[PDB]
Symmetry: C3
Subunit: 288 residues, 3 copies
């Protein structure tokens, strides 16, 4: 048309030919445990709905043309049991990783991040960095406890980003810091500027960074459709700006997006999620 | 009462005696075409509801008393066919224009802007400026294509204000710029300050400026009740501040407000729309 | 658990032993009169719901541990007639005041503030300050008219904070100012920074300050669940920051919170209200 969008980049016939591969994880488990509501398993469908509709491939405001990228939608990870779904998720992300392609996993609840991280720890033995963008710091199932408990993974390369002190147990903080992980509280992200704060974060995570974006880290005024709606947090613009940085940052080797919940809110929030991926995609179009 | 509001300025018995004339255009057509939902035809009723209720005529925070202005509500433009409704709309705005009064048109979808602009091109032969405040830049029915295609109208005097690169076809940008029109992306409006950016815009539009305000240019966090809800965009305060500037700016000769959709959201969004008009009215009270 | 919250501070067996005492006032009367909707009487229940669930007692982002404070929930003020409910409310707040404890009153509509203020004027004869955080300045039942009309109370120590010129009768302003009270318009609070502006306000109110927080002074984008939803106003973060200041400010001797309305919105808004109290509580933990 007069206005080619994200849909037009899905010209890769074989997954092996796509620069970026989208994987769905339609399962609830995550913040629904810590008070949140059911429904995150519907996130992948809602994301896909707007995926077919949004995001000009040539953005003249940012002046980035992503027309050259190929996207592929590998579908949903489905399994008879939950732990098996975890296994098939990890195995799938790893394969995409192993061949040099970029995996983006749309969820689904926080718990997908554990499989995703292990896929990383296999793909880059001992040289993985991880950032959790999340208003929550829950590490008592608790995906980042699992990763901190990994032999291969160095905690000096783990950042909790935009976490909120009103929602973070002190034992939880203690654990991360005792593992030499870094807490970057919302107030400080906001103090520095989100993108600048996130630059700092990639300095800490370094090579082979897993960019994990819990969307309940955004304020519910912009992002109400999540299992654990946030009173304060990142604005939609900050989110976009951060996704663009991640995309242009060549050490960022995969991304997941957690907690999208269309039962909580079904129109505005899925648009934000697609626009976040969109900005990532634009950023990606700029790397060598 | 102890608190005279906008309703009290409707003391003009004859339209001819009102400084400002309100015209309703209860028709859907506009962004409902480009994905949006039906319902904008209900905007004029919802606007009128809050019109009867809001806006202290003497504002001691801005220290502007609008007590001296007279408003008149000329009602809705109604017609058996749509193109006829367009004709009666243009003809009506022109008459108000022709006699020196100020027309404010409440919609209704974007498409009203075409009739409105032609009313301007008749009233000020060859000396019209136009600003489209809109997160969208759609010019492939497409009201501003129609105006750019006008012999009389000079594109050097056309500004797209607060448009969003994630929602603007590059062919669409190309067309405007190839007509010597100006793109003022959201990011740059926000960079400069909305009012300062809008001052710049009136410098470009100049004499006999048509102030066209698509309300889906505001973020849906403030302005959810529109046909095409915006993830990012102008805040309500920015909108008010911009309407006040327009009002005090003597080259601004008419105004329309598009895309208000009470089926999408019916309480918060109509209040914003009335408050936007309210600020315009205050600004107007300050011109010579 | 790994994450002790506000609930854990309710270890005071006898009210007399609690540093802070929560009193519910489940009555509508207030802004429902001036256009608002019914439902504020449900605020205390909704507040209590989230009270059982939110607010880490040790906040490592602010680095304040409130673990040492004791809270007590004295329940709801209930009465056969409304004026009697007013009497029992005042009498109760006074008793808590008289013994040195800190009363926090959750409403309920604006009208609770009159009883609350009289409780103050009894407890500190002639030496009371009052701040009304409110997008409204309504003083024509009208709780602050009642207090300004008090012999004992000095108007030089009354501040209207974050009031909005689009919603304030000029006779209303005139009355306050003619009583030597101070208007601190939203625009100026925002100009200075909310906390800095509020510091200024406590300078004016001084000793024995009643911190009265109408929650419809926040923008409805953050705080939609109120009887009179605000188009513009304080952000949730500003609210929290202001509540923290109030808490650490030793001249602040009681607090009330008005206009919470779960019939308007029932999940996001009650969370904000509890988080506001939470921040107050943290601030309180810091005073000598
Ligand atoms: Mn999480
Ligand atoms: Mn979270
Ligand atoms: Mn438009
Ligand atoms: Mn638009
Ligand atoms: Mn009030
Ligand atoms: Mn109020």
């Amino acid at each position: 048309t007069d206005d080619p969008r994200l849909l037009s980049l899905f010209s890769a016939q074989r997954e092996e030919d796509a620069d970026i591969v989208i994987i769905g994880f339609p399962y609830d488990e995550g913040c629904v445990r810590n008070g949140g509501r059911a429904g995150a398993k519907k996130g992948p469908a809602a994301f896909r709905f707007f995926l077919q509709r949004l995001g000009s491939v040539n953005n003249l405001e940012l002046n980035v043309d992503a027309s050259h990228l190929k996207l592929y939608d590998a579908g949903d990870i489905t399994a008879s049991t939950l732990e098996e779904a975890h296994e098939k998720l990890e195995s799938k992300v790893f394969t995409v990783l192993a061949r040099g392609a970029f995996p983006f996993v749309i969820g689904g609840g926080n718990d997908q991040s554990a499989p995703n991280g292990r896929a990383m720890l296999r793909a880059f033995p001992g040289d993985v960095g991880v950032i959790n963008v999340d208003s929550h710091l829950d590490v008592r199932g608790t995906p980042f406890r699992q990763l901190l408990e990994e032999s291969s993974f160095s905690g000096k390369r783990f950042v909790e980003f935009a976490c909120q002190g009103s929602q973070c147990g002190a034992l939880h903080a203690q654990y991360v810091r005792d593992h030499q992980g870094h807490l970057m509280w919302l107030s400080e992200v906001r103090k520095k500027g989100a993108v600048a704060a996130l630059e700092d974060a990639f300095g800490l995570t370094g090579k082979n960074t897993f960019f994990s974006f819990d969307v309940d880290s955004l304020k519910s005024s912009d992002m109400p459709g999540v299992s654990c709606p946030a009173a304060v947090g990142l604005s939609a613009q900050e989110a976009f700006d951060m996704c663009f940085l991640a995309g242009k940052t060549p050490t960022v080797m995969m991304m997941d997006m957690s907690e999208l919940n269309p039962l909580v809110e079904e129109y505005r929030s899925p648009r934000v999620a697609v626009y976040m991926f969109y900005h990532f995609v634009l950023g990606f179009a700029t790397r060598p």
